[PDB]
Short mmCIF file of C-alpha atoms and ligand atoms in Angstrom, two decimals:
data_model
loop_
_atom_site.label_atom_id
_atom_site.label_comp_id
_atom_site.label_asym_id
_atom_site.label_seq_id
_atom_site.Cartn_x
_atom_site.Cartn_y
_atom_site.Cartn_z
CA UNK A 5 -24.78 -17.26 4.24
CA UNK A 6 -21.45 -16.07 2.85
CA UNK A 7 -20.30 -14.84 6.27
CA UNK A 8 -20.88 -18.42 7.40
CA UNK A 9 -18.54 -20.11 4.93
CA UNK A 10 -15.73 -17.62 5.58
CA UNK A 11 -16.56 -17.49 9.29
CA UNK A 12 -14.06 -20.14 10.44
CA UNK A 13 -11.35 -18.55 8.30
CA UNK A 14 -11.92 -14.89 9.15
CA UNK A 15 -11.53 -15.72 12.84
CA UNK A 16 -8.48 -17.85 12.02
CA UNK A 17 -6.69 -15.08 10.11
CA UNK A 18 -7.73 -12.66 12.85
CA UNK A 19 -6.11 -14.90 15.46
CA UNK A 20 -2.92 -15.14 13.40
CA UNK A 21 -3.00 -11.40 12.68
CA UNK A 22 -2.69 -10.78 16.42
CA UNK A 23 -0.05 -13.48 16.60
CA UNK A 24 1.99 -11.78 13.88
CA UNK A 25 2.07 -8.48 15.77
CA UNK A 26 3.37 -9.86 19.08
CA UNK A 27 6.52 -7.91 19.97
CA UNK A 28 9.07 -7.61 22.77
CA UNK A 29 8.87 -3.89 22.02
CA UNK A 30 6.37 -2.13 24.27
CA UNK A 31 5.09 0.69 22.02
CA UNK A 32 5.06 -1.32 18.80
CA UNK A 33 2.90 -4.04 20.33
CA UNK A 34 0.50 -1.36 21.58
CA UNK A 35 0.56 0.53 18.27
CA UNK A 36 0.15 -2.56 16.09
CA UNK A 37 -2.76 -3.62 18.28
CA UNK A 38 -4.21 -0.09 18.14
CA UNK A 39 -4.73 -0.17 14.37
CA UNK A 40 -5.48 -3.89 14.28
CA UNK A 41 -8.28 -3.28 16.78
CA UNK A 42 -9.63 -0.41 14.68
CA UNK A 43 -12.57 -1.63 12.59
CA UNK A 44 -11.37 -3.44 9.48
CA UNK A 45 -13.72 -5.06 6.96
CA UNK A 46 -10.91 -7.52 6.12
CA UNK A 47 -12.09 -7.39 2.50
CA UNK A 48 -8.68 -8.40 1.12
CA UNK A 49 -8.43 -11.69 3.03
CA UNK A 50 -12.00 -12.36 1.87
CA UNK A 51 -10.80 -12.17 -1.73
CA UNK A 52 -7.70 -14.26 -1.04
CA UNK A 53 -9.72 -17.03 0.61
CA UNK A 54 -12.57 -17.04 -1.92
CA UNK A 55 -10.15 -17.04 -4.85
CA UNK A 56 -8.46 -20.14 -3.42
CA UNK A 57 -11.79 -21.91 -2.99
CA UNK A 58 -12.60 -21.83 -6.71
CA UNK A 59 -10.97 -25.22 -7.26
CA UNK A 60 -10.87 -28.27 -4.99
CA UNK A 61 -7.70 -27.84 -2.92
CA UNK A 62 -6.36 -27.37 0.63
CA UNK A 63 -3.27 -25.38 1.62
CA UNK A 64 -1.94 -23.74 4.78
CA UNK A 65 -0.48 -21.19 2.36
CA UNK A 66 -3.94 -19.90 1.45
CA UNK A 67 -4.98 -18.56 4.85
CA UNK A 68 -1.48 -17.22 5.57
CA UNK A 69 -1.47 -15.31 2.28
CA UNK A 70 -4.60 -13.53 3.47
CA UNK A 71 -2.89 -12.67 6.77
CA UNK A 72 0.01 -11.03 4.96
CA UNK A 73 -2.16 -8.91 2.68
CA UNK A 74 -3.98 -7.38 5.65
CA UNK A 75 -0.64 -6.61 7.29
CA UNK A 76 0.56 -4.81 4.16
CA UNK A 77 -2.77 -3.01 3.76
CA UNK A 78 -2.59 -1.78 7.36
CA UNK A 79 1.09 -0.93 7.00
CA UNK A 80 0.15 1.44 4.18
CA UNK A 81 -2.62 3.06 6.26
CA UNK A 82 -0.41 3.94 9.24
CA UNK A 83 2.07 5.61 6.90
CA UNK A 84 -0.74 7.16 4.86
CA UNK A 85 -2.48 8.91 7.74
CA UNK A 86 0.82 10.44 8.85
CA UNK A 87 1.55 11.70 5.34
CA UNK A 88 -1.99 12.96 4.78
CA UNK A 89 -2.18 14.47 8.28
CA UNK A 90 -5.40 12.57 8.97
CA UNK A 91 -6.21 12.14 12.66
CA UNK A 92 -9.14 9.74 12.30
CA UNK A 93 -9.68 6.19 11.05
CA UNK A 94 -13.24 4.81 11.02
CA UNK A 95 -13.73 6.65 14.32
CA UNK A 96 -10.41 5.58 15.84
CA UNK A 97 -7.45 7.92 16.31
CA UNK A 98 -4.49 7.42 13.97
CA UNK A 99 -1.22 6.04 15.33
CA UNK A 100 0.82 9.23 14.92
CA UNK A 101 -1.73 11.05 17.08
CA UNK A 102 -2.30 8.29 19.65
CA UNK A 103 1.49 7.86 19.96
CA UNK A 104 3.86 9.95 17.82
CA UNK A 105 5.51 10.30 14.40
CA UNK A 106 8.44 7.99 15.16
CA UNK A 107 6.15 5.18 16.35
CA UNK A 108 3.91 5.68 13.33
CA UNK A 109 6.77 5.18 10.87
CA UNK A 110 8.32 2.29 12.82
CA UNK A 111 5.07 0.36 13.20
CA UNK A 112 4.40 0.70 9.47
CA UNK A 113 7.76 -0.85 8.64
CA UNK A 114 7.20 -3.39 11.42
CA UNK A 115 3.90 -4.53 9.93
CA UNK A 116 5.52 -4.82 6.50
CA UNK A 117 8.35 -6.83 8.05
CA UNK A 118 6.04 -9.37 9.71
CA UNK A 119 3.82 -9.54 6.63
CA UNK A 120 6.87 -10.55 4.60
CA UNK A 121 8.00 -12.90 7.36
CA UNK A 122 4.60 -14.63 7.23
CA UNK A 123 4.89 -15.54 3.53
CA UNK A 124 8.63 -16.21 3.51
CA UNK A 125 7.59 -19.84 3.99
CA UNK A 126 6.09 -20.01 0.51
CA UNK A 127 8.97 -21.13 -1.71
CA UNK A 128 7.77 -19.65 -4.99
CA UNK A 129 9.38 -16.95 -7.15
CA UNK A 130 6.22 -16.17 -9.13
CA UNK A 131 4.35 -15.59 -5.87
CA UNK A 132 6.92 -13.11 -4.60
CA UNK A 133 7.39 -11.55 -8.05
CA UNK A 134 3.69 -10.67 -8.13
CA UNK A 135 3.53 -9.45 -4.54
CA UNK A 136 6.71 -7.38 -4.64
CA UNK A 137 5.62 -5.95 -7.98
CA UNK A 138 2.30 -4.65 -6.68
CA UNK A 139 3.93 -3.15 -3.58
CA UNK A 140 6.39 -1.27 -5.81
CA UNK A 141 3.50 -0.11 -8.01
CA UNK A 142 1.55 1.19 -5.02
CA UNK A 143 4.56 3.31 -4.06
CA UNK A 144 4.86 4.54 -7.65
CA UNK A 145 1.20 5.55 -7.57
CA UNK A 146 1.79 7.47 -4.35
CA UNK A 147 4.77 9.33 -5.80
CA UNK A 148 2.67 10.32 -8.81
CA UNK A 149 -0.23 11.40 -6.63
CA UNK A 150 2.02 13.59 -4.49
CA UNK A 151 3.49 15.24 -7.59
CA UNK A 152 0.01 15.68 -9.07
CA UNK A 153 -1.23 17.66 -6.06
CA UNK A 154 -2.43 21.13 -7.13
CA UNK A 155 -1.22 20.43 -10.66
CA UNK A 156 -3.92 20.78 -13.32
CA UNK A 157 -4.80 19.25 -15.63
CA UNK A 158 -4.67 15.58 -14.73
CA UNK A 159 -5.31 13.40 -17.77
CA UNK A 160 -7.94 10.62 -17.64
CA UNK A 161 -5.20 8.03 -18.23
CA UNK A 162 -3.19 9.45 -15.32
CA UNK A 163 -6.28 9.28 -13.09
CA UNK A 164 -6.98 5.65 -13.97
CA UNK A 165 -3.30 4.92 -13.36
CA UNK A 166 -3.52 6.64 -9.97
CA UNK A 167 -6.56 4.73 -8.71
CA UNK A 168 -5.22 1.47 -10.14
CA UNK A 169 -2.05 1.54 -8.05
CA UNK A 170 -3.57 2.87 -4.86
CA UNK A 171 -6.52 0.49 -4.62
CA UNK A 172 -7.05 -1.79 -7.62
CA UNK A 173 -3.77 -3.75 -7.77
CA UNK A 174 -3.53 -4.77 -4.11
CA UNK A 175 -7.01 -6.29 -4.45
CA UNK A 176 -6.05 -7.80 -7.81
CA UNK A 177 -3.06 -9.34 -6.03
CA UNK A 178 -5.41 -10.75 -3.40
CA UNK A 179 -7.33 -12.66 -6.06
CA UNK A 180 -4.16 -13.57 -7.94
CA UNK A 181 -2.04 -14.79 -5.01
CA UNK A 182 -5.09 -16.61 -3.65
CA UNK A 183 -5.48 -18.36 -6.99
CA UNK A 184 -1.80 -19.32 -7.00
CA UNK A 185 -1.88 -20.83 -3.50
CA UNK A 186 -4.52 -23.21 -4.87
CA UNK A 187 -3.03 -24.07 -8.27
CA UNK A 188 -6.05 -22.71 -10.16
CA UNK A 189 -6.06 -23.04 -13.97
CA UNK A 190 -5.02 -20.18 -16.26
CA UNK A 191 -8.54 -19.65 -17.68
CA UNK A 192 -10.14 -19.41 -14.24
CA UNK A 193 -7.20 -17.47 -12.78
CA UNK A 194 -7.48 -14.79 -15.45
CA UNK A 195 -11.16 -14.13 -14.73
CA UNK A 196 -10.87 -13.89 -10.94
CA UNK A 197 -7.73 -11.80 -11.43
CA UNK A 198 -9.61 -9.35 -13.68
CA UNK A 199 -12.55 -9.43 -11.27
CA UNK A 200 -10.31 -8.18 -8.48
CA UNK A 201 -8.85 -5.45 -10.68
CA UNK A 202 -12.22 -4.20 -11.93
CA UNK A 203 -13.94 -4.30 -8.52
CA UNK A 204 -11.10 -2.23 -7.04
CA UNK A 205 -11.35 0.31 -9.85
CA UNK A 206 -15.10 0.70 -9.42
CA UNK A 207 -14.77 0.95 -5.64
CA UNK A 208 -12.14 3.71 -5.77
CA UNK A 209 -14.28 5.79 -8.13
CA UNK A 210 -17.15 5.40 -5.68
CA UNK A 211 -14.79 6.50 -2.89
CA UNK A 212 -13.85 9.58 -4.91
CA UNK A 213 -17.52 10.31 -5.54
CA UNK A 214 -18.34 10.02 -1.84
CA UNK A 215 -15.65 12.57 -1.03
CA UNK A 216 -17.98 15.06 -2.71
CA UNK A 217 -21.47 13.64 -2.16
CA UNK A 218 -21.39 12.21 1.37
CA UNK A 219 -21.30 14.12 4.66
CA UNK A 220 -18.60 14.19 7.34
CA UNK A 221 -20.53 11.41 9.12
CA UNK A 222 -19.86 8.58 6.66
CA UNK A 223 -16.50 10.13 5.73
CA UNK A 224 -15.00 10.98 9.11
CA UNK A 225 -13.53 14.07 7.45
CA UNK A 226 -14.72 17.29 5.77
CA UNK A 227 -16.64 17.02 2.49
CA UNK A 228 -14.27 17.73 -0.39
CA UNK A 229 -11.13 16.52 1.37
CA UNK A 230 -9.42 15.31 -1.79
CA UNK A 231 -9.55 18.65 -3.58
CA UNK A 232 -8.67 20.56 -0.40
CA UNK A 233 -5.42 18.61 -0.46
CA UNK A 234 -4.88 19.20 -4.18
CA UNK A 235 -6.13 15.86 -5.48
CA UNK A 236 -7.91 16.16 -8.82
CA UNK A 237 -10.31 13.25 -9.28
CA UNK A 238 -12.66 12.11 -12.04
CA UNK A 239 -15.75 13.73 -10.52
CA UNK A 240 -14.02 17.12 -10.76
CA UNK A 241 -12.72 16.28 -14.25
CA UNK A 242 -16.20 15.28 -15.42
CA UNK A 243 -17.82 18.38 -13.92
CA UNK A 244 -15.36 20.64 -15.73
CA UNK A 245 -16.03 18.95 -19.08
CA UNK A 246 -19.81 19.30 -18.65
CA UNK A 247 -19.59 23.03 -17.89
CA UNK A 248 -17.36 23.57 -20.93
CA UNK A 249 -20.16 21.96 -22.95
CA UNK A 250 -22.44 24.71 -21.63
CA UNK A 251 -19.68 27.15 -22.68
CA UNK A 252 -18.72 27.81 -19.05
CA UNK A 253 -15.03 27.30 -18.26
CA UNK A 254 -14.78 29.25 -14.99
CA UNK A 255 -14.38 26.05 -12.96
CA UNK A 256 -11.47 25.02 -15.17
CA UNK A 257 -9.84 28.39 -14.59
CA UNK A 258 -10.32 28.14 -10.83
CA UNK A 259 -8.90 24.62 -10.56
CA UNK A 260 -5.95 25.55 -12.78
CA UNK A 261 -5.08 28.44 -10.46
CA UNK A 262 -5.76 26.35 -7.37
CA UNK A 263 -2.99 26.39 -4.77
CA UNK A 264 -2.17 24.95 -1.35
CA UNK A 265 -2.99 28.39 0.09
CA UNK A 266 -6.40 28.73 -1.60
CA UNK A 267 -9.37 30.14 0.34
CA UNK A 268 -12.19 27.89 1.55
CA UNK A 269 -14.65 29.89 -0.57
CA UNK A 270 -12.93 28.55 -3.67
CA UNK A 271 -13.23 24.97 -2.41
CA UNK A 272 -16.88 25.39 -1.44
CA UNK A 273 -17.52 26.61 -4.98
CA UNK A 274 -15.66 23.64 -6.46
CA UNK A 275 -17.56 21.16 -4.31
CA UNK A 276 -21.00 22.40 -5.34
CA UNK A 277 -20.05 22.48 -9.04
CA UNK A 278 -18.93 18.87 -8.75
CA UNK A 279 -22.15 17.84 -6.99
CA UNK A 280 -24.17 19.44 -9.77
CA UNK A 281 -22.23 18.26 -12.81
CA UNK A 282 -19.73 15.50 -11.99
CA UNK A 283 -21.58 12.84 -10.00
CA UNK A 284 -23.51 11.06 -12.76
CA UNK A 285 -20.61 10.61 -15.19
CA UNK A 286 -18.50 9.26 -12.30
CA UNK A 287 -21.25 6.79 -11.40
CA UNK A 288 -21.54 5.81 -15.04
CA UNK A 289 -17.80 5.11 -15.26
CA UNK A 290 -17.83 3.21 -11.96
CA UNK A 291 -20.69 1.09 -13.32
CA UNK A 292 -18.67 0.18 -16.42
CA UNK A 293 -15.95 -1.37 -14.25
CA UNK A 294 -18.58 -3.03 -12.06
CA UNK A 295 -20.33 -4.58 -15.06
CA UNK A 296 -16.96 -5.69 -16.43
CA UNK A 297 -16.25 -7.46 -13.13
CA UNK A 298 -19.64 -9.18 -13.40
CA UNK A 299 -18.71 -10.55 -16.82
CA UNK A 300 -15.54 -12.15 -15.45
CA UNK A 301 -17.57 -13.68 -12.62
CA UNK A 302 -20.05 -15.10 -15.13
CA UNK A 303 -17.29 -16.70 -17.20
CA UNK A 304 -15.92 -18.87 -14.40
CA UNK A 305 -17.43 -22.29 -13.63
CA UNK A 306 -20.80 -22.25 -11.86
CA UNK A 307 -20.33 -23.08 -8.18
CA UNK A 308 -21.15 -22.21 -4.58
CA UNK A 309 -18.21 -19.82 -4.26
CA UNK A 310 -19.34 -17.87 -7.33
CA UNK A 311 -22.48 -16.82 -5.46
CA UNK A 312 -20.50 -15.44 -2.51
CA UNK A 313 -18.32 -13.31 -4.79
CA UNK A 314 -21.42 -12.02 -6.58
CA UNK A 315 -22.99 -11.04 -3.26
CA UNK A 316 -19.82 -9.16 -2.33
CA UNK A 317 -20.00 -7.46 -5.74
CA UNK A 318 -23.52 -6.24 -4.91
CA UNK A 319 -22.54 -5.00 -1.45
CA UNK A 320 -19.32 -3.15 -2.31
CA UNK A 321 -20.83 -1.36 -5.31
CA UNK A 322 -24.26 -0.64 -3.81
CA UNK A 323 -23.82 3.13 -4.24
CA UNK A 324 -23.81 2.71 -8.04
CA UNK A 325 -26.35 -0.11 -8.30
CA UNK B 4 32.70 0.69 -6.95
CA UNK B 5 31.43 -2.88 -7.29
CA UNK B 6 28.94 -4.33 -9.78
CA UNK B 7 26.08 -4.44 -7.26
CA UNK B 8 26.63 -0.78 -6.38
CA UNK B 9 26.28 0.21 -10.05
CA UNK B 10 23.08 -1.85 -10.24
CA UNK B 11 21.26 -0.17 -7.35
CA UNK B 12 22.60 3.32 -8.12
CA UNK B 13 21.31 2.94 -11.67
CA UNK B 14 17.86 1.96 -10.43
CA UNK B 15 17.76 4.74 -7.80
CA UNK B 16 18.87 7.42 -10.29
CA UNK B 17 16.06 6.25 -12.57
CA UNK B 18 13.59 6.72 -9.72
CA UNK B 19 14.76 10.23 -8.88
CA UNK B 20 14.51 11.03 -12.58
CA UNK B 21 10.94 9.73 -12.86
CA UNK B 22 9.42 10.45 -9.44
CA UNK B 23 10.28 13.94 -8.13
CA UNK B 24 9.08 12.99 -4.62
CA UNK B 25 11.66 10.21 -4.30
CA UNK B 26 14.69 11.48 -2.39
CA UNK B 27 17.87 9.41 -2.27
CA UNK B 28 20.18 10.12 0.68
CA UNK B 29 23.75 8.81 0.62
CA UNK B 30 24.49 5.18 1.48
CA UNK B 31 26.35 4.64 4.75
CA UNK B 32 30.03 4.60 3.79
CA UNK B 33 31.00 2.08 6.47
CA UNK B 34 28.22 -0.34 5.56
CA UNK B 35 29.12 -0.15 1.86
CA UNK B 36 32.76 -1.14 2.49
CA UNK B 37 31.55 -4.13 4.52
CA UNK B 38 28.86 -5.21 2.05
CA UNK B 39 31.51 -5.03 -0.69
CA UNK B 40 33.27 -8.02 0.90
CA UNK B 41 30.19 -10.06 1.82
CA UNK B 42 30.01 -13.60 0.45
CA UNK B 43 26.59 -13.35 -1.23
CA UNK B 44 24.99 -12.74 -4.64
CA UNK B 45 24.70 -9.38 -6.37
CA UNK B 46 20.97 -9.41 -5.61
CA UNK B 47 21.38 -9.93 -1.85
CA UNK B 48 23.87 -7.06 -1.62
CA UNK B 49 21.35 -4.76 -3.29
CA UNK B 50 18.54 -5.77 -0.95
CA UNK B 51 20.85 -5.21 2.01
CA UNK B 52 21.90 -1.74 0.89
CA UNK B 53 18.30 -0.89 0.02
CA UNK B 54 16.76 -1.90 3.35
CA UNK B 55 19.65 -0.44 5.34
CA UNK B 56 19.26 2.97 3.73
CA UNK B 57 15.50 2.65 4.07
CA UNK B 58 15.68 2.36 7.85
CA UNK B 59 18.39 5.00 8.24
CA UNK B 60 16.18 7.49 6.38
CA UNK B 61 13.70 6.83 9.17
CA UNK B 62 15.69 9.12 11.47
CA UNK B 63 15.70 12.07 9.05
CA UNK B 64 11.91 12.28 8.65
CA UNK B 65 10.67 15.77 9.58
CA UNK B 66 7.39 17.54 8.96
CA UNK B 67 9.19 19.45 6.21
CA UNK B 68 10.31 16.37 4.26
CA UNK B 69 7.73 13.74 5.22
CA UNK B 70 5.69 13.64 1.99
CA UNK B 71 9.01 12.81 0.36
CA UNK B 72 10.90 10.72 2.93
CA UNK B 73 8.13 8.41 4.16
CA UNK B 74 7.29 7.11 0.69
CA UNK B 75 10.96 6.98 -0.24
CA UNK B 76 11.68 4.57 2.63
CA UNK B 77 8.83 2.44 1.31
CA UNK B 78 10.09 1.96 -2.25
CA UNK B 79 13.47 1.16 -0.76
CA UNK B 80 11.69 -1.51 1.28
CA UNK B 81 9.82 -2.63 -1.83
CA UNK B 82 13.07 -2.72 -3.77
CA UNK B 83 14.59 -4.85 -1.02
CA UNK B 84 11.73 -7.30 -1.53
CA UNK B 85 12.09 -7.05 -5.30
CA UNK B 86 15.79 -7.97 -5.17
CA UNK B 87 15.15 -11.25 -3.35
CA UNK B 88 12.18 -12.50 -5.35
CA UNK B 89 13.48 -13.68 -8.76
CA UNK B 90 14.95 -16.05 -8.06
CA UNK B 91 13.57 -16.37 -4.53
CA UNK B 92 16.39 -16.19 -1.98
CA UNK B 93 14.36 -17.84 0.79
CA UNK B 94 17.06 -18.01 3.47
CA UNK B 95 18.29 -14.44 2.98
CA UNK B 96 14.67 -13.28 2.93
CA UNK B 97 13.78 -14.96 6.25
CA UNK B 98 16.92 -13.48 7.80
CA UNK B 99 16.58 -9.90 6.58
CA UNK B 100 12.81 -9.58 7.09
CA UNK B 101 13.53 -10.60 10.66
CA UNK B 102 16.20 -7.90 10.80
CA UNK B 103 13.61 -5.36 9.67
CA UNK B 104 11.27 -6.44 12.45
CA UNK B 105 14.03 -6.37 15.09
CA UNK B 106 15.58 -3.05 14.05
CA UNK B 107 12.24 -1.30 14.51
CA UNK B 108 11.95 -2.93 17.92
CA UNK B 109 15.41 -1.75 18.97
CA UNK B 110 14.69 1.81 17.84
CA UNK B 111 11.51 2.00 19.94
CA UNK B 112 13.25 0.69 23.05
CA UNK B 113 16.07 3.11 22.24
CA UNK B 114 13.65 6.01 22.70
CA UNK B 115 13.11 4.88 26.30
CA UNK B 116 16.66 4.57 27.66
CA UNK B 117 19.19 7.14 28.88
CA UNK B 118 21.90 4.85 30.28
CA UNK B 119 25.28 5.46 28.62
CA UNK B 120 26.60 1.94 27.98
CA UNK B 121 23.13 0.67 27.05
CA UNK B 122 22.87 3.41 24.44
CA UNK B 123 26.26 2.65 22.90
CA UNK B 124 25.40 -1.06 22.75
CA UNK B 125 21.91 -0.80 21.25
CA UNK B 126 23.11 1.72 18.67
CA UNK B 127 25.87 -0.72 17.72
CA UNK B 128 23.21 -3.40 17.29
CA UNK B 129 21.05 -1.08 15.17
CA UNK B 130 23.87 0.20 12.97
CA UNK B 131 25.10 -3.32 12.13
CA UNK B 132 21.64 -4.92 12.05
CA UNK B 133 21.64 -6.05 8.41
CA UNK B 134 25.27 -7.13 8.09
CA UNK B 135 25.89 -9.12 11.29
CA UNK B 136 23.95 -12.23 10.20
CA UNK B 137 26.55 -12.48 7.43
CA UNK B 138 29.58 -12.49 9.72
C1 LIG C 401 4.40 0.81 3.49
C2 LIG C 401 3.62 0.26 2.33
C3 LIG C 401 3.28 -1.20 2.28
C4 LIG C 401 3.22 1.07 1.34
C5 LIG C 401 3.56 2.54 1.40
C6 LIG C 401 2.76 3.29 0.34
C7 LIG C 401 1.49 3.83 0.95
C8 LIG C 401 1.53 4.55 2.26
C9 LIG C 401 0.32 3.65 0.31
C10 LIG C 401 -0.98 4.16 0.88
C11 LIG C 401 -2.12 3.29 0.38
C12 LIG C 401 -3.24 4.15 -0.15
C13 LIG C 401 -4.32 4.38 0.59
C14 LIG C 401 -5.43 5.24 0.04
O1 LIG C 401 -4.97 6.60 -0.04
P1 LIG C 401 -5.97 7.80 0.33
O2 LIG C 401 -6.62 8.28 -0.94
O3 LIG C 401 -5.23 8.78 1.22
O4 LIG C 401 -7.08 7.03 1.19
P2 LIG C 401 -7.77 7.67 2.50
O5 LIG C 401 -8.47 8.91 2.00
O6 LIG C 401 -8.70 6.57 2.97
O7 LIG C 401 -6.61 7.95 3.43
MG1 LIG C 402 -2.61 9.25 0.79
MG1 LIG C 403 -4.88 9.30 3.79
MG1 LIG C 404 -10.42 9.02 -0.59
#
């Protein structure tokens, strides 16, 4: 019944999403459409909208905030897939493959441009302070991730930092900016804000877990993609610590000497060690963030909207619950 | 060197010092001299220089420098947005975000034209994209 309440809005933002991409440029219109047509769970607008519906209020700002977040989210994906060399997206070809590198970079900046155009209406420094801050942070996270490739060890703090910027904060901004465009009170804003942050953390851990556990079918790319590109994630970290407990530090030695030119045999070894030793601690950690998000949901006033958020919390974190 | 130039060069040098994958190419000398004399705040001049350099870096993106250059154009875009947000320069924001949209449009259409005069004219429009609205 939650896809019924957001039904009129999801189709509204979708309509405006296609409006925002209209361009007198031939390729860009095609390219923008290409990724905008590609799947999309629109989970960020769903947080924006629901966060604004916590208190009794109506604004045209609310639904247009959601539109902008999606545009920024998709702007990051186009650029991402070109940087990461990915050729697939939920079963759809990536823009740099379907078109070329130049189009891929242009369309990314184009989406960011229109996303910022869309919210330029909202005359509010705090709003833009928050939004521009998270965008900067996402970049910072990407810089750190790129420098952390094939560089062991990665501290637990640095890992949390990494997954915070690349997933958690944009979702936290969704709940925060949504709460602003509805003048929600500080007590209720804090809880939904921390809900968004914790749900994003938990979700990104799950994603990192799936990189090891799942098959190429639900991934769309080889199992162990993160480590094959040098990315050290908590599942690997946890697996290493467990083996050291059993006095076995061979995995540690292998990862330390890991290089961009490493043989597939070394990756296959790493993958299986992670599957055997790193999955459960990663699930445990993910659960902590999930349970923390539940607490913040339970502390906000009982209402209809609360139930929708709770049902999204069950869906997104199903792999751990 | 103006005040605004010191401001952005300080912030960029801090980024290169902190994030090794941020690469800072030189600002366009012609666009600096023009921005110097623009009748706007220190913050708007920074945003202009940031977003201008961002888009110009677009042309230098290889396969050998992409995991550096792509992200670097994105902080420069994020900086641009950061410079116009506290306080919120609404008018300058609407103008320049439009410029960002249009300059990407002109660069696409540029890829599909060989005519001589049409090339010289569109390039002119692309080079001066972010400073014309202020003249
Ligand atoms: C232009 C802009 C707004 C921001 C630029 C900064 C960029 C590109 C951020 C990328 C956002 C992160 C996506 C997840 O990365 P992953 O771990 O590679 O995710 P998957 O494996 O799904 O690709
Ligand atoms: Mg990436
Ligand atoms: Mg990627
Ligand atoms: Mg991943």
